[PDB]
Amino acid sequence: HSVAVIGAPFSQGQKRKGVEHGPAAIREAGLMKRLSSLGCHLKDFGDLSFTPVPKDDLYNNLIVNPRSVGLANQELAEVVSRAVSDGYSCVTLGGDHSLAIGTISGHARHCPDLCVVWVDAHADINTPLTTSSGNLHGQPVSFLLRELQDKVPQLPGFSWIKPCISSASIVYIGLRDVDPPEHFILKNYDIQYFSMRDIDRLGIQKVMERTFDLLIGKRQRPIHLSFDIDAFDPTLAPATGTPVVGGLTYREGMYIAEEIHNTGLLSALDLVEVNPQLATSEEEAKTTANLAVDVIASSFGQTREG
Amino acid sequence: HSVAVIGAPFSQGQKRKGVEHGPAAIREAGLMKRLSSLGCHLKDFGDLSFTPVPKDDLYNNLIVNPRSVGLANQELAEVVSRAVSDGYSCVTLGGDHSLAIGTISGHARHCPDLCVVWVDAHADINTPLTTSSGNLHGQPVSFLLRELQDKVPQLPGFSWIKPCISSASIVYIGLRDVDPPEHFILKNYDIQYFSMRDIDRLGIQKVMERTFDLLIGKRQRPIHLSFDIDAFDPTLAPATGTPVVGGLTYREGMYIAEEIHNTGLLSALDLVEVNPQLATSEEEAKTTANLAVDVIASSFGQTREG
Amino acid sequence: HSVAVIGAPFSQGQKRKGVEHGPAAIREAGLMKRLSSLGCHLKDFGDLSFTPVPKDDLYNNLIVNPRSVGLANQELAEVVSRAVSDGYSCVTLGGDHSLAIGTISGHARHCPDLCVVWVDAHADINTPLTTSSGNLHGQPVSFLLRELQDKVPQLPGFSWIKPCISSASIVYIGLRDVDPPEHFILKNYDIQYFSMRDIDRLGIQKVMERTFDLLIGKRQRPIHLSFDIDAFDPTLAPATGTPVVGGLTYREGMYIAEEIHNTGLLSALDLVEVNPQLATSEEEAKTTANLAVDVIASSFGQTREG
Ligand SMILES: N[C@](CCCC[B-](O)(O)O)(CCN1CCC(O)CC1)C(=O)O
Ligand SMILES: N[C@](CCCC[B-](O)(O)O)(CCN1CCC(O)CC1)C(=O)O
Ligand SMILES: N[C@](CCCC[B-](O)(O)O)(CCN1CCC(O)CC1)C(=O)O
Ligand SMILES: [Mn+2]
Ligand SMILES: [Mn+2]
Ligand SMILES: [Mn+2]
Ligand SMILES: [Mn+2]
Ligand SMILES: [Mn+2]
Ligand SMILES: [Mn+2]
Numbered sequence: 001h002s003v004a005v006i007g008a009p010f011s012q013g014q015k016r017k018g019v020e021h022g023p024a025a026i027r028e029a030g031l032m033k034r035l036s037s038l039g040c041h042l043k044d045f046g047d048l049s050f051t052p053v054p055k056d057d058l059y060n061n062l063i064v065n066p067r068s069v070g071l072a073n074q075e076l077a078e079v080v081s082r083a084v085s086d087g088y089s090c091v092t093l094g095g096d097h098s099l100a101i102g103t104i105s106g107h108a109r110h111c112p113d114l115c116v117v118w119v120d121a122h123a124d125i126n127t128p129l130t131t132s133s134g135n136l137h138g139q140p141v142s143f144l145l146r147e148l149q150d151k152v153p154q155l156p157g158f159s160w161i162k163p164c165i166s167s168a169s170i171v172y173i174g175l176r177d178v179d180p181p182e183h184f185i186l187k188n189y190d191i192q193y194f195s196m197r198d199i200d201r202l203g204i205q206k207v208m209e210r211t212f213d214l215l216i217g218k219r220q221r222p223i224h225l226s227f228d229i230d231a232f233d234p235t236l237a238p239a240t241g242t243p244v245v246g247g248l249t250y251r252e253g254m255y256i257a258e259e260i261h262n263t264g265l266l267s268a269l270d271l272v273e274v275n276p277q278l279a280t281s282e283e284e285a286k287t288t289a290n291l292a293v294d295v296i297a298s299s300f301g302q303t304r305e306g
Numbered sequence: 307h308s309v310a311v312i313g314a315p316f317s318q319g320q321k322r323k324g325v326e327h328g329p330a331a332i333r334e335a336g337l338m339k340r341l342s343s344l345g346c347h348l349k350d351f352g353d354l355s356f357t358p359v360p361k362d363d364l365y366n367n368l369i370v371n372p373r374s375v376g377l378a379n380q381e382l383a384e385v386v387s388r389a390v391s392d393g394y395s396c397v398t399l400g401g402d403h404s405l406a407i408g409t410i411s412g413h414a415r416h417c418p419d420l421c422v423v424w425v426d427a428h429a430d431i432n433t434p435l436t437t438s439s440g441n442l443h444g445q446p447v448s449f450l451l452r453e454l455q456d457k458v459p460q461l462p463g464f465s466w467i468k469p470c471i472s473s474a475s476i477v478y479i480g481l482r483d484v485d486p487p488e489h490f491i492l493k494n495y496d497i498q499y500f501s502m503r504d505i506d507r508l509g510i511q512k513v514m515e516r517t518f519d520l521l522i523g524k525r526q527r528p529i530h531l532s533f534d535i536d537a538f539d540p541t542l543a544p545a546t547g548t549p550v551v552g553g554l555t556y557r558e559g560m561y562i563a564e565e566i567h568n569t570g571l572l573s574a575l576d577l578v579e580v581n582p583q584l585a586t587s588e589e590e591a592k593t594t595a596n597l598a599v600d601v602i603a604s605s606f607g608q609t610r611e612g
Numbered sequence: 613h614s615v616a617v618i619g620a621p622f623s624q625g626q627k628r629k630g631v632e633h634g635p636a637a638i639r640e641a642g643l644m645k646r647l648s649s650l651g652c653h654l655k656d657f658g659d660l661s662f663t664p665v666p667k668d669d670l671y672n673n674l675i676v677n678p679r680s681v682g683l684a685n686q687e688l689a690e691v692v693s694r695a696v697s698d699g700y701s702c703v704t705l706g707g708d709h710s711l712a713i714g715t716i717s718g719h720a721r722h723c724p725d726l727c728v729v730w731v732d733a734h735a736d737i738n739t740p741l742t743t744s745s746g747n748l749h750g751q752p753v754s755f756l757l758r759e760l761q762d763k764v765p766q767l768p769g770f771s772w773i774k775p776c777i778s779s780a781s782i783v784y785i786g787l788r789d790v791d792p793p794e795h796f797i798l799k800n801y802d803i804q805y806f807s808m809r810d811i812d813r814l815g816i817q818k819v820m821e822r823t824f825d826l827l828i829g830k831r832q833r834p835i836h837l838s839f840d841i842d843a844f845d846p847t848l849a850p851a852t853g854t855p856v857v858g859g860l861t862y863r864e865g866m867y868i869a870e871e872i873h874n875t876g877l878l879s880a881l882d883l884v885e886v887n888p889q890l891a892t893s894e895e896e897a898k899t900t901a902n903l904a905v906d907v908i909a910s911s912f913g914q915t916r917e918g
Contacts, residue, residue, distance in 0.1 A: 123612075178612030186612075195611045200561050201511045205813040245600075246556045246610070250858045255812045294857075304858070305807045306735075306790030429918075484918030492918075501917045506867050507817045551906075552862045552916070 013098025018277025070157025319404025376463025625710025630889025682769020
């Protein structure tokens with residue numbers, strides 16, 4: 001059992017400074033030792049340095065840093081593809097969530113039947129035509145879903161991307177802040193999700209049962225876990241750019257990670273949006289980073305019963 | 307869909323200064339825009355100024371401000387009655403919970419088959435003969451329930467009140483601090499309630515299902531939601547006069563409000579007992595008021611999924 | 613209905629100073645008045661002073677204060693036995709969890725068919741051959757279980773102890789920090805437990821149902837509740853020596869206690885590991901002690917509905 005750890009310090013998917021220090025904060029919270037102790041063989045790729053693009057002007061006077069996000073994702077995809085081909089489960093540390101464009105593309109390159117569990121307060125499925133922010137970290141899923149491509153225009157620096165998964169192959173968990181055009185998209189393409197409300201109704205156990213039945217109920221598939229730290233309640237994960245009240249509890253987050261581990265199918269994991277600079281204190285930053293480590297470790301077999 | 311907003315800054319239902327600033331606090335937290343965004347057509351009656359009563363002596367050397375509370379409610383009932391008769395769902399902002407005497411009386415004046423969902427840490431059903439505090443905010447249900455009336459003496463300033471709710475038409479959610487004579491009343495009159503213990507057992511989904519079966523299971527009825535902010539855990543709503551540990555989570559409160567909205571029957575709502583002065587800090591005051599706005603917005607259609 | 617309250621200010625079952633002040637903190641938080649209010653007839657034994665042992669050297673260069681813990685427990689067992697024989701339900705305030713060796717031995721002396729509910733973040737079932745800390749508060753169950761006696765060496769000061777519980781007669785609730793030898797022990801002897809994970813899945817109501825089915829499903833037995841304050845999440849019980857994130861909520865703790873009371877079979881209760889010195893503020897110390905009084909009171913009949 002081998003795990004590749006990749007630092008992807010990207011910030012250009014949004015506008016708030018500091019998310020680029022996420023990977024370092026997560027490492028400092030003891031990630032590598034935690035994974036080693038579970039018996040993971042580790043390759044640390046370090047923090048990547050992405051090639052910048054000069055004069056990376058607004059696309060359509062709205063989408064910010066499109067070429068930089070495109071190129072950095074192209075490079076990240078390469079590293080992820082290569083690491084999966086060498087037999088590593090891939091852990092990518094963010095960084096803002098636009099890097100899932102790169103990790104999922106790289107992952108799907110030779111694992112085209114992968115499925116995605118997207119744990120997040122947000123759906124991240126705005127297209128360039130629906131986003132009201134221009135921030136690519138709120139759009140990553142739109143570039144990945146094949147049913148959507150007639151609705152997704154061609155961004156400078158994005159041409160290397162080819163929609164790799166079907167809308168039946170991603171399930172959301174934790175939703176609570178969804179833009180109206182994203183609601184439309186989720187309903188219109190019948191994309192399955194479990195909002196905080198569904199968790200309130202069903203309980204996290206049934207949510208995971210139904211998630212897996214939908215994705216791997218009839219066949220084994222490599223799992224991509226894309227975990228936005230803002231899925232957790234802001235009291236637990238304050239150091240993040242877009243906190244939304246009413247999130248997952250600590251126990252809920254661990255249970256999700258546990259069930260991910262229990263499938264035996266986890267092939268890649270994104271842990272994104274930890275921004276240590278947004279914490280009002282050092283303790284707030286460290287608790288967020290510690291929580292990130294707990295998720296990753298539980299995803300690779302750390303249990304609550306020894 | 308039309309909504310009337312009425313500020314009722316009453317404090318004389320109890321002894322702690324500051325609850326009369328509840329309405330201003332809730333408005334400052336952005337109530338009106340939130341309602342507008344949902345598509346509510348809004349009529350703001352502003353904050354009412356209630357007529358004072360000279361020489362409003364204790365009743366029976368115990369009950370404080372009887373005539374002031376009586377008259378203020380009479381005046382409040384008039385405003386509520388008029389707004390509901392003009393087609394408005396009526397939102398009343400408190401103020402202590404004694405104002406439910408006026409809002410429920412006024413609501414019933416136009417919609418006599420109304421039922422009541424009472425969300426509260428407390429039962430508020432003491433009578434003038436059982437109260438150990440003398441505070442009218444802990445007695446309002448006693449003046450409203452038909453079955454209790456031969457046990458409720460006539461208070462100065464209360465003679466205009468016609469008890470308008472049968473004991474089978476009110477359901478409590480959130481109970482955890484109930485005086486022994488209130489417990490006797492609840493059992494003797496077979497009044498239904500879901501205490502925090504019941505919520506622990508059933509979960510909030512089943513609690514709402516059963517609440518609606520009891521109230522509107524046989525026929526459609528207009529719903530009065532009387533929501534005491536102290537129903538929420540003190541950690542979430544610190545700025546209130548009688549906090550009690552072990553209350554509703556944020557998610558539970560939202561789920562209650564959502565199910566209220568989903569019936570299509572909400573006709574009036576009280577949001578009471580927000581006291582900004584009892585906050586330890588301005589942060590605690592704003593989070594309590596923000597929570598109040600979330601309850602109201604959710605009750606009129608705000609969802610956690612877009 | 614008679615309750616004996618025994619202060620057991622012991623600290624030598626572990627290495628952190630201050631847990632010996634647990635009983636006083638709990639008394640200061642109003643324990644006696646709370647029990648009286650429920651109709652408990654009270655005998656206060658005050659805080660016991662345990663006989664010290666000179667030159668109490670490490671056993672096997674690892675196990676700390678063995679003779680001191682052995683002797684204090686022998687003395688405590690005598691007091692508990694006498695109180696139980698005199699017809700008292702026995703409340704023992706700690707002090708570290710090694711005192712359960714004494715309370716359970718004393719209790720079993722007159723009620724040999726007793727069963728045990730162990731509420732705790734930890735399993736406390738290391739033996740002198742498996743412990744990595746050397747701290748006896750993490751081993752008390754090992755001295756009590758009949759099935760383990762062939763794997764438990766004889767310690768100085770421990771010779772009076774006669775294992776009195778079968779492995780089918782103890783249930784754990786709340787586990788989340790279990791050493792690998794303890795996990796082996798639990799599975800190997802088929803000791804039943806409900807980890808935090810089980811609680812996330814089942815809900816606390818189902819957990820208590822199954823707990824009682826296992827222990828008293830066939831016959832009525834006197835119940836010993838051994839409650840380590842660290843079962844609660846550290847946000848609620850911060851003043852304790854070995855806190856572990858992701859614990860019981862307030863409501864879960866009350867629910868557990870309420871069910872214990874509802875059996876009518878509660879015969880003895882330990883409330884251990886309150887260490888007021890580990891609080892970073894007096895408020896933190898007080899809320900922990902307040903929480904301890906809530907558990908005890910609820911175990912003897914305090915309700916959330918009056
Ligand atoms: N839907 C958002 C989501 C941002 C969070 C991205 B993440 O990776 O962290 O989940 C936010 C849209 N929102 C619309 C209302 C405005 O007031 C603020 C931006 C967007 O920018 O598209
Ligand atoms: N039962 C109470 C209710 C207070 C809360 C009113 B509300 O609108 O906020 O729900 C409190 C009675 N309690 C009796 C014990 C005394 O120590 C304190 C007051 C009362 O004053 O009648
Ligand atoms: N298993 C522990 C239990 C301590 C808590 C006892 B209690 O009464 O409070 O439940 C802890 C073992 N742990 C092993 C890893 C070390 O780094 C820390 C101690 C032990 O010391 O044996
Ligand atoms: Mn995201
Ligand atoms: Mn997000
Ligand atoms: Mn109340
Ligand atoms: Mn009230
Ligand atoms: Mn213990
Ligand atoms: Mn413990």
